[PDB]
Amino acid sequence: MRECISIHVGQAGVQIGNACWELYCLEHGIQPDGQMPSDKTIGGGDDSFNTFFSETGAGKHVPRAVFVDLEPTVIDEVRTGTYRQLFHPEQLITGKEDAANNYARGHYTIGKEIIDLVLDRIRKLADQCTGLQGFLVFHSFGGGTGSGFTSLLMERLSVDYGKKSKLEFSIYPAPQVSTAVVEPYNSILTTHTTLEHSDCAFMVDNEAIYDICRRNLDIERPTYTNLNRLISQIVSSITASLRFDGAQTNLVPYPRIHFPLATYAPVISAEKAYHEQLSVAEITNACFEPANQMVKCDPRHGKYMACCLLYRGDVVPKDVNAAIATIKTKRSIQFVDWCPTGFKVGINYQPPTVVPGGDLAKVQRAVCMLSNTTAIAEAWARLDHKFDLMYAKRAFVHWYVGEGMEEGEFSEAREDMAALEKDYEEVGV
Amino acid sequence: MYTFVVRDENSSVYAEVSRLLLATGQWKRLRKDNPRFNLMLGERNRLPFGRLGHEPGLVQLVNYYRGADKLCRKASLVKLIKTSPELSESCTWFPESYVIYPTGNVWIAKGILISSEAHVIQKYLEKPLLLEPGHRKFDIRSWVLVDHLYNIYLYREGVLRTSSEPYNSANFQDKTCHLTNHCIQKNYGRYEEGNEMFFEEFNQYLMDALNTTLENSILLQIKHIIRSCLMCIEPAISTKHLHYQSFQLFGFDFMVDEELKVWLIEVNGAPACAQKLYAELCQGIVDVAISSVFPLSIFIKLHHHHHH
Amino acid sequence: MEVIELNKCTSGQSFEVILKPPDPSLEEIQKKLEAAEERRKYQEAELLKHLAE
Amino acid sequence: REIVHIQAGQCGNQIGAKFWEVISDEHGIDPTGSYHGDSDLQLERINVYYNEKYVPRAILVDLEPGTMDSVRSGPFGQIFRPDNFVFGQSGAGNNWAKGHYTEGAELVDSVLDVVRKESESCDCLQGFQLTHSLGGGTGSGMGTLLISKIREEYPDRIMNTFSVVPSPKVSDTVVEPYNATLSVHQLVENTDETYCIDNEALYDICFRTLKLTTPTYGDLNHLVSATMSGVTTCLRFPGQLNADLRKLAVNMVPFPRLHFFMPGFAPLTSQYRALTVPELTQQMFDAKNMMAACDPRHGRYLTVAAVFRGRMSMKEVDEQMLNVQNKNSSYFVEWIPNNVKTAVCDIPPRGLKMSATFIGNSTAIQELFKRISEQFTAMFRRKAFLHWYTGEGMDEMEFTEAESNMNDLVSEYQQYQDA
Ligand SMILES: Nc1nc2c(ncn2[C@@H]2O[C@H](COP(=O)(O)OP(=O)(O)OP(=O)(O)O)[C@@H](O)[C@H]2O)c(=O)[nH]1
Numbered sequence A: 001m002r003e004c005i006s007i008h009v010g011q012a013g014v015q016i017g018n019a020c021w022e023l024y025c026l027e028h029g030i031q032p033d034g035q036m037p038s039d040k041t042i043g044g045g046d047d048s049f050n051t052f053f054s055e056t057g058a059g060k061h062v063p064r065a066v067f068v069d070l071e072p073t074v075i076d077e078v079r080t081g082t083y084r085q086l087f088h089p090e091q092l093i094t095g096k097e098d099a100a101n102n103y104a105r106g107h108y109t110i111g112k113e114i115i116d117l118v119l120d121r122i123r124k125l126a127d128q129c130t131g132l133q134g135f136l137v138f139h140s141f142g143g144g145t146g147s148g149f150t151s152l153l154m155e156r157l158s159v160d161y162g163k164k165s166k167l168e169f170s171i172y173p174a175p176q177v178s179t180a181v182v183e184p185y186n187s188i189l190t191t192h193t194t195l196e197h198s199d200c201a202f203m204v205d206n207e208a209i210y211d212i213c214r215r216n217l218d219i220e221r222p223t224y225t226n227l228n229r230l231i232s233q234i235v236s237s238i239t240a241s242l243r244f245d246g247a248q249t250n251l252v253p254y255p256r257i258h259f260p261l262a263t264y265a266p267v268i269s270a271e272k273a274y275h276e277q278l279s280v281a282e283i284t285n286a287c288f289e290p291a292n293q294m295v296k297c298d299p300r301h302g303k304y305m306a307c308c309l310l311y312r313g314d315v316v317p318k319d320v321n322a323a324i325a326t327i328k329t330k331r332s333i334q335f336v337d338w339c340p341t342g343f344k345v346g347i348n349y350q351p352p353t354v355v356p357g358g359d360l361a362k363v364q365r366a367v368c369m370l371s372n373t374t375a376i377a378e379a380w381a382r383l384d385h386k387f388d389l390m391y392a393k394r395a396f397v398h399w400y401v402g403e404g405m406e407e408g409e410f411s412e413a414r415e416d417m418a419a420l421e422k423d424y425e426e427v428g429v
Numbered sequence B: 001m002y003t004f005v006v007r008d009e010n011s012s013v014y015a016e017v018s019r020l021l022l023a024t025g026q027w028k029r030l031r032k033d034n035p036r037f038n039l040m041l042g043e044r045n046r047l048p049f050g051r052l053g054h055e056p057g058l059v060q061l062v063n064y065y066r067g068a069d070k071l072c073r074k075a076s077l078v079k080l081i082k083t084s085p086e087l088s089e090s091c092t093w094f095p096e097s098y099v100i101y102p103t104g105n106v107w108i109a110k111g112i113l114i115s116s117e118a119h120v121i122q123k124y125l126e127k128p129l130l131l132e133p134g135h136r137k138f139d140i141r142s143w144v145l146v147d148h149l150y151n152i153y154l155y156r157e158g159v160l161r162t163s164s165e166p167y168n169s170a171n172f173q174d175k176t177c178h179l180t181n182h183c184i185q186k187n188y189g190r191y192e193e194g195n196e197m198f199f200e201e202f203n204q205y206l207m208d209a210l211n212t213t214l215e216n217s218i219l220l221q222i223k224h225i226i227r228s229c230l231m232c233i234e235p236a237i238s239t240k241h242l243h244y245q246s247f248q249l250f251g252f253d254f255m256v257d258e259e260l261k262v263w264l265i266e267v268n269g270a271p272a273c274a275q276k277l278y279a280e281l282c283q284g285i286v287d288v289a290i291s292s293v294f295p296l297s298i299f300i301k302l303h304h305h306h307h308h
Numbered sequence C: 001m002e003v004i005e006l007n008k009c010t011s012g013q014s015f016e017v018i019l020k021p022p023d024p025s026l027e028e029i030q031k032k033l034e035a036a037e038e039r040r041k042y043q044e045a046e047l048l049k050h051l052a053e
Numbered sequence D: 001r002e003i004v005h006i007q008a009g010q011c012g013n014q015i016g017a018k019f020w021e022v023i024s025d026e027h028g029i030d031p032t033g034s035y036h037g038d039s040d041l042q043l044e045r046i047n048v049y050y051n052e053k054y055v056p057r058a059i060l061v062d063l064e065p066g067t068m069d070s071v072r073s074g075p076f077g078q079i080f081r082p083d084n085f086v087f088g089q090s091g092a093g094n095n096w097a098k099g100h101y102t103e104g105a106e107l108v109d110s111v112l113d114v115v116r117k118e119s120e121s122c123d124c125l126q127g128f129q130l131t132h133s134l135g136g137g138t139g140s141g142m143g144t145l146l147i148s149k150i151r152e153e154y155p156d157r158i159m160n161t162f163s164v165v166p167s168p169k170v171s172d173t174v175v176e177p178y179n180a181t182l183s184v185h186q187l188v189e190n191t192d193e194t195y196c197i198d199n200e201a202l203y204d205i206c207f208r209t210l211k212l213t214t215p216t217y218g219d220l221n222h223l224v225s226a227t228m229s230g231v232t233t234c235l236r237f238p239g240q241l242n243a244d245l246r247k248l249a250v251n252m253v254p255f256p257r258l259h260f261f262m263p264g265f266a267p268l269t270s271q272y273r274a275l276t277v278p279e280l281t282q283q284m285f286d287a288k289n290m291m292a293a294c295d296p297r298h299g300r301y302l303t304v305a306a307v308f309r310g311r312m313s314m315k316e317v318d319e320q321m322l323n324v325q326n327k328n329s330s331y332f333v334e335w336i337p338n339n340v341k342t343a344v345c346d347i348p349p350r351g352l353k354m355s356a357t358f359i360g361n362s363t364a365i366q367e368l369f370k371r372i373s374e375q376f377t378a379m380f381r382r383k384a385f386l387h388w389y390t391g392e393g394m395d396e397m398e399f400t401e402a403e404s405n406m407n408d409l410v411s412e413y414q415q416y417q418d419a
C-alpha cells in the first residue's frame, strides 16, 4: 500500500485531528476502541484503509498519527476522551510550556527541547510502513507551536525523509476567532521557512469557515467544534481516494505555487427538517461560487492551473460531464495558456458521513473541488499588508528578538512573500 | 454614523460625493489607510480589491467594479466585442476595429492619427451628422451608474461635446475640426458655452431641423448599446454573493452618423462631469448607489426582458 | 469535451475531462538553532551583569 | 500553570488580602482551605493560584508587623501558609531608601527563601504578581528591590504588578512623588506588565460617581478588588484568550517599556437590575470607569483586552465590541490590526449577574506619569525633604536618573500616539 502518516501540531492541529480521526473511524466502521468488525483479515491487511490505520494482533486499528503540542492541556483531552483507546500513549506527545503565540519560541527556544523526541516517534511509525508515501501536517499559521514548531519539523523531515511528499493543512488566521495580535508575523515566518519543504498546502481561512457555519448551518456564534467538523469533511474528501478503492503532479506545475483553493458543497443544516435535494449540476455550480470556498477570494479575477473534483454519493459520470460542460459556458473559468483546460474527477459512491449530533445534514451527494488558482494570492496580500503595518513600527518584534531571532529573519521572510506575490501575479494577469 | 475613505484626490466627481456625504452629518471621513470603513472611494490604478470584505461588523462598498477595465481600455474593448457571442464580430454599432502592436478606406489610430494608408486601428466615421450653423462634428457623452444590485441607471442629462470648426473631408492632418475633445478644442465657445450643447437644445435642433426627436432618433440606440455592453460583462464583474459590494460610474461616448445611426467609440471607467451637472449627478450617486446600501429620480433604469 | 483515463471499481470511479488543449543539511539546522541559543545566552548574561552592578 | 503572589507593605497587604477573599469566594474555597462549590469550572485551573486543602501560593511581606497581625486576624487570614508571613520590626517610615537600600535589604533574603520554596514545588512556574503601593516605603522601595532580586533568580519568568499610584486626594505624606518616581524607574526596567491602579481615579469614582463624600481605603479597595478579580479571570478559568501571563504580555505589549495598563470596570458599585451588553460595553470604555486617571480620548489605544463575565449572548458581545471600534476607530492605532481582544467567562463575580473588565494599553497613561513628574520636580528643584534620602546613603544623582527615565517614558508614549 502507500501509507500516510499524519502529524497534528499545536492546538488547532490537534483539535482538527480529533475531528478527522473521528470522521475516518465512522466512515470505515472502526469503533472507538479500534475494533473494526467488517475487517476479516485480523492482525494485518493490504486494504485502502490501511493507508491510514495499522493493525495489531488483537484486531485493533491504530491511526498512523502523531499529536504534538508544547503544552499538555489539549492533548490531555485526547488521552481521557472518547477516542483515548484508539491511540498508543507514545503517539500523544506534550511538553509543559507553550510557545506563547511566538513563532520564535516555537521554533528556537521550546522547539529544540522536544524535536528529537518527535522525530523518533515518527520514525517508529515510518518503520511500520511497507511503502511510505508521505506526511500530512495539520497546524495553525498563527499559534507559536503551529507556526514555529511546524517549520522546524518540516526542515527536519526533508533531511530524514528527502524522497517523501509533505502536504499541509494549514489554518489561516481570522480576527473573529484569533487569539493573538501577532498572528500575521507568525504566518509569514512559518510560510517563509516551510515554503521549500512542502509539496502542497491546503489553507483554510477561519473566516470562510466561520461564515459558512453562520450562513448555512444557522449557528449564531460558531465554536471550534463547529468549524473543525466542517474542516474534517474537506479533509476527508481530500484523502478519500487514499482511504477507499479508486484513482501534486496534477495540482502543482510550479514548485512555489502550491496552495490550492478548496471548495465544498453542499453544507446544509441538520435542523433543516424539509430539505430539497441538490443535483449534480447544482453542487458542481456551487463549487465556483465564492461563498463556498475555504478562503474568500474571487477566482474570476485570477487563472486556473488545475482542478480536481471528488464527488461523494449518488453521482454517475454522465451528469458530472453535463454539469462541467454547462459550467464552461456560464462562468469565468480562464486557465493559464500552458495548462489544459480540464478537470480531474474522482467519484466515490459511498454517501458522505456525518457525526451523529453534528450540524451537517446527511446528503445524497456532495463534491469537494481543489483548484489551483492565482486568486488565492488575495489571502497573501491581506496577510502581508497587516504584517507591514506592524513591522514598520517594529511592534512586538522584541518578543522575537528576545528568543534569539534577528530582525533580518522578518525582512527576509517578507521579501519571500513579496516574491511569492510577484509569482502569482505573473501567472494570473 | 457611516464611515468612508478617499483614495482619489484627483477625482472631480467623488470629491463632490465626499462633500455631499459629510454635509449629511451621518458620514465620517476616516484616514486614507484606516480599514474600518463602510465605503472606499478608490484609487484608479491597482485598487486593493482583495482586502475588501474582510472586516467583521462592516458592510463594505467600493466605487469600482473589479474587471470593468475590459470595457474601458481600447485594446480590451475591441477584444471583448469580437469574442463575446452576445456582441460578436457582426455587432452593428461598434466600428470595425483592430488590435495591433509596435516593433473610402479612412481609419484612425489610438497622440492620435487619421489616414487612408498605414494601439487600435478603427474605421474613421466619414459622413458624421453635422450640426448647423457651422457644418461641425460632435460626440455624445452619457453617464451610467451601475449599482451593487447591477441596476443600470442612465443619467437623463448627457452632453454633446462639439467642434467649433467646419468639418473637412479633404484634410485629416488638422485636428479640432476632426477631434471633439473639450481639452483639445481649447473659435472655441462660439455657438454654445464651452463647446457643450446639452439635451434640451439638441432635441430642439433635431425637431426644428430633422423632424425627429432625440429620444426616437438617438437614445433608443444609446440605451441599447449600454445595456448590451454591461449585461455582457455582468457574470464577470457582478458582486451579488461576493463579500464586498461594488458600484461604478461610467462615461459612454457616442458618434452619430448622418443617417442618424449611433456608434460606440469608447467606454470610460473614471469619467468627469460637465460643470452644470455636477450637483445633480453626484446627488443621484449618493441616492441610488450609497444610501441604498447605507440608509439615512434623475436616472432612467435600463431594463428590457423581452421574450423568445 | 474529451473524457479520458476512465477507471471503475465497486466503491467508486475516476476520469479526466479535457474541454480544451493548451534543502539545508542537518548541520546547517543545528547551526542556525545554536546561533539563536548563543544570542539568548548573551542577552541573559548581559542582564545578569547589569543586575550584578 | 503556577503563579507566585507576593504582597508588600500596608497597601500591598490590604488589597492583597482583599484579592484572596474575592477569588477564594469565586473558586468556592472557604477560610479553612476547604472546597464547597457546585461547578467543576472553579477547580479546573485552581492550581494557578493555590497549592494542594487549598492554600494560596501567597507570600506576605512588610517591614512593620502591624499590618501582618490585621491580615492574620482578618476574614481569610487562617488560609495563608503561616511560614509565608515574613516581617521585620523596624518599619520603613514612608521612605523609599529605607525599603530599597537599608532596612529592606536586611529582610529581603528571608522573603527570597519563601519565594524559592514556593517556586521550587511548581510544576511549571509562569511567574509572579506583586501587589504594592508606590507612595510608601516598603511596598515601593522594598517591593522594587524584590522584583530586581526575583529577576536575577528567575530571569526568564514573567513579572506582573498591581501598583497603586499616589495622589494628594488620598495622601499619607508629601514625599509620595519622590517614592513613586524612584519606583517607576524600577518598574520600567524590571516588570513585564504593570496594572496602574490610581488612587486619584479611585477617589474620583467614589466621590463623583458612587456619591461617597469621604471615601475610606475600604471603598477605594472595593474597586481595586473587583478590578483584580476581573483582570485575572483569564488566568483562573478555562479560556482561549490571555490564559497565561506570557500570552497576555505578547498581546498587550508592543514595545518592552510601554507595559503600563489602564484598567476599567463596569458596573461601578459599592444592584437590582443587570446591565445590558450594550451598557456594559459603553461604560467599560468610559473615562469615568478607568482606574487610572487618564482621559483615553487624549491618546490612542495600542492594545485592549476586554473580559465579559456572566451569562450573556456572545453574539451581542461581538457586535457591541465591533461597534465601539468601528465608531471610535481613530482612538485605536491603525498600525496594529485587530488590537482589541475579547474573552467571555460564564461565572460572574459575587453580587453581579453581568460584568465587564477593561485592560487598556493607552498612550494617554502619560497623563499619570506627568502628574507624578510635576509633583516630583516642584519639590526636587528646591531639594525639599531630600536629606531623608541622602541620610540613608543615596545621591541626588539617583533622583536625577529616575526623573529622566520617567520623562523618557512619557516621550515614548507621545511618539507612538503621533505615529
Ligand atoms: N479552525 C480552528 N482554528 C483554531 C483551533 N484552535 C486554534 N485555532 C486558531 O489557531 C490560531 C491559534 O493557534 P493555536 O493552534 O491555538 O496555537 P498553538 O499551536 O497551540 O501555539 P501556542 O499556544 O502558541 O504554543 C488562531 O488563529 C485560532 O483561531 C481549532 O480547533 N480550529
Ligand SMILES: Nc1ncnc2c1ncn2[C@@H]1O[C@H](COP(=O)(O)OP(=O)(O)CP(=O)(O)O)[C@@H](O)[C@H]1O
Residues within 6 Å of the ligand: B095, B108, B110, B122, B123, B124, B125, B126, B138, B139, B178, B179, B180, B181, B251, B253, B255, B265, B266, B268
Ligand atoms: N472612429 C471614429 N470616427 C469618428 N471620430 C472619432 C473616431 N474615433 C475617435 N474619434 C474622435 O476622437 C475623439 C476622442 O476619441 P477617443 O474617445 O478615442 O479618445 P478619448 O479617450 O480621449 C475621449 P475621453 O476623454 O472621453 O476618454 C472623439 O470625441 C471623436 O470625435
Ligand SMILES: Nc1nc2c(ncn2[C@@H]2O[C@H](COP(=O)(O)OP(=O)(O)O)[C@@H](O)[C@H]2O)c(=O)[nH]1
Residues within 6 Å of the ligand: D008, D009, D010, D011, D012, D014, D015, D092, D093, D094, D095, D133, D134, D135, D136, D137, D138, D139, D140, D164, D165, D166, D167, D170, D171, D172, D176, D199, D202, D217, D220, D221, D224
Ligand atoms: N488604594 C489604597 N491605597 C493605599 C492603601 N494603603 C495605603 N495606600 C496608599 O499607599 C501610599 C502609602 O503606602 P503604604 O503601603 O502605607 O506604605 P508601605 O507600608 O511603606 O508600603 C499612599 O499613596 C496611600 O494613599 C490601601 O489600602 N488602598
Ligand SMILES: [Ca+2]
Residues within 6 Å of the ligand: A039, A040, A041, A042, A043, A044, A045, A046, A055
Ligand atoms: Ca485487516
Ligand SMILES: [Ca+2]
Residues within 6 Å of the ligand: D090, D103, D106
Ligand atoms: Ca537594622
Ligand SMILES: [Mg+2]
Residues within 6 Å of the ligand: A010, A011, A071, A098, A099, A143, A145
Ligand atoms: Mg497552544
Ligand SMILES: [Mg+2]
Residues within 6 Å of the ligand: D010, D136, D172
Ligand atoms: Mg501607610
